[PDB]
């Protein structure tokens, strides 16, 4: 296809801090990956972010009941949808699965959710910060995550190495030893 | 702490539109325009919550009426194609004769059109494959997950072939062993 | 619990 493509995008975003105690609502309209008009609950009205959206910002802000409706969106939309899915979104907990191999020894924790994780090493009684390389957090796209911590620190005479993983779904640290 | 995003788009002249809900980077559900059904990313979600899909179809109608207006507002200037980063991944430890799933991750591309194919030993492999909708990004490009289950072996190579108008030739990432 | 779509607004012409 020689044909040129034209893309419209709109995103209604709900930002939550300390649960539903502090909510911010954003109504965002995009054209060719370039926002042009936006409503912000902190601002309280539609505003053009580019000149391309100024006819919308003035037209929409003048509509009967528009402002009232958008000012109420933090309660009727964001807080509403937050509580509808709270059981399996904010409260989802899947514990990790750890395995340690060498290739340099690697500890890999998979199938965990949410994303916040802390994994540490111990060579052996004390954690050794040197020689650690972290893969970063990997999003599996199926509501699980991955991570490998590759460790360049050759163990020697019966050295017991333990990858310690700390996830919000468990009450005490998860420890496995090599 | 948490962000819920209702993300919609419409693409001309392919007449392609999409409606999904994002939670902290993971999709809660999308609406299948063709079947007019709500599609939960996890089947478990559908037993605890609901969504009337036809309200998503009404939005797609509006977005498209808007798009024509927005392209006319813009003197019919097209989108600049952007080629995708792709990455083939494994899911858990790889072990001989122990079933895993291959993951092909397509990132930072626009427009949201893509031909992706799984190649086993240079031959196309079509059965067992799963696929996600395009997922929104903060830079407003798109992401896509393709999954291929398999039993690992030594006499089997695997590739993920990606076609995107941003690329001059098809992009391909390899996985062996 | 049912989810709510925020409706898309028609642009100015």
């Amino acid at each position, epitope marked *: 296809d020689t044909r040129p493509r034209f893309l419209e995008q709109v995103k209604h975003e709900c930002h939550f801090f300390n649960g539903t105690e502090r909510v911010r609502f954003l109504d965002r309209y995009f054209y060719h990956q370039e926002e042009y008009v936006r409503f912000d609950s902190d601002v309280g009205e539609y505003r053009a972010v580019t000149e391309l959206g100024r006819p919308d910002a003035e037209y929409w802000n*003048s509509q*009967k009941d528009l402002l009232e*409706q958008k000012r109420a969106a933090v309660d*009727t939309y964001c807080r*509403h949808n937050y509580g509808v899915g709270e059981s399996f979104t904010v409260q989802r907990r899947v514990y990790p699965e750890v395995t340690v191999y060498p290739a340099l020894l690697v500890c890999s924790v998979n199938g965990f959710y949410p994303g916040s994780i802390e994994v540490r090493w111990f060579r052996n009684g004390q954690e050794e910060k040197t020689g650690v390389v972290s893969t970063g957090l990997i999003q599996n796209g199926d509501w699980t995550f991955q991570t490998l911590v590759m460790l360049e620190t050759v163990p020697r005479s019966g050295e017991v190495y333990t990858c310690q993983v700390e996830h919000p779904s468990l009450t005490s640290p998860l420890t496995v030893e090599w | 702490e948490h962000v819920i995003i209702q993300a919609e788009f419409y693409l001309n002249p392919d007449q392609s539109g999409e409606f999904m809900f994002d939670f902290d980077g993971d999709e809660i559900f999308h609406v299948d325009m063709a079947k007019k059904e709500t599609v939960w990313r996890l089947e478990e979600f559908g037993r605890f919550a609901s*969504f009337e899909a*036809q309200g998503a179809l009404a939005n797609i109608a509006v977005d498209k009426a808007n798009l024509e207006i927005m392209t006319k507002r813009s003197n019919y200037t097209p989108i600049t194609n952007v080629p995708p980063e792709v990455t083939v991944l494994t899911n858990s430890p790889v072990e001989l004769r122990e079933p895993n799933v291959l993951i092909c991750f397509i990132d930072k591309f626009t427009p949201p059109v893509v031909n992706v194919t799984w190649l086993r030993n240079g031959k196309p492999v079509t059965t067992g494959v799963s696929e996600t909708v395009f997922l929104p990004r903060e830079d407003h490009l798109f992401r896509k997950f393709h999954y291929l289950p398999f039993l690992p072996s030594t006499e089997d190579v695997y590739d993920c072939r990606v076609e995107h108008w941003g690329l001059d030739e098809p992009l391909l990432k390899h996985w062996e062993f | 619990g*049912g989810y709510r779509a925020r409706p898309a607004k028609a642009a100015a012409t």
Partner: T-cell receptor
Amino acid sequence: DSVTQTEGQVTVSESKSLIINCTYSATSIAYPNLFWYVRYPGEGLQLLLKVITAGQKGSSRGFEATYNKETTSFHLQKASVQESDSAVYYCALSDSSSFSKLVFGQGTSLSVVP
Amino acid sequence: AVFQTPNYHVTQVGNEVSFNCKQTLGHDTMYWYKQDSKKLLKIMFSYNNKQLIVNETVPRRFSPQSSDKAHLNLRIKSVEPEDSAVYLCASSLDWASQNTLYFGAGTRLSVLE
């Protein structure tokens, strides 16, 4: 999805207090929105008041209505009706999760007698 | 405001009638409601941005039409005595159910044998 309210006409002397009963029994919708619409003689239908969150109270023109989460009701009350309150009052619900689509009660015609 | 037209109409069974409505609120969504002889108020149609989004199983007789966001027209191809009613046009900011509906004065249709 049904709304039932006071059927027929109610006659009330001015300065007396008024209750218009309204209960909703909609098997198939979670979190409804509740409305009171009013039609003054020779006029068109217009909103009296609405409540869009489960526990709150809406007020207008001296009228009051509480969205009850236990009695599944939206009773309309006024402490001292005035003669200009003579009208037809409509109780209505809508599904907050779907398209706006009002299910109306049968309507109560109020005649405030001086 | 919500203007509808005509105010009164009388016609024999089998004829065609057309009702027209207009709202000046800048709203996206318009409606047809039917007010039958017995003080009842049931929704017939709902249009959003010229697209039909709600149809409460109305007989094929009725054909709403909207070439513009602000206009909603109703046409009844060949009327039956059951069609005698008051038809109310309304408008709402969008199709969200929290939105207030604003109603017109109504069209009073009387269909006679």
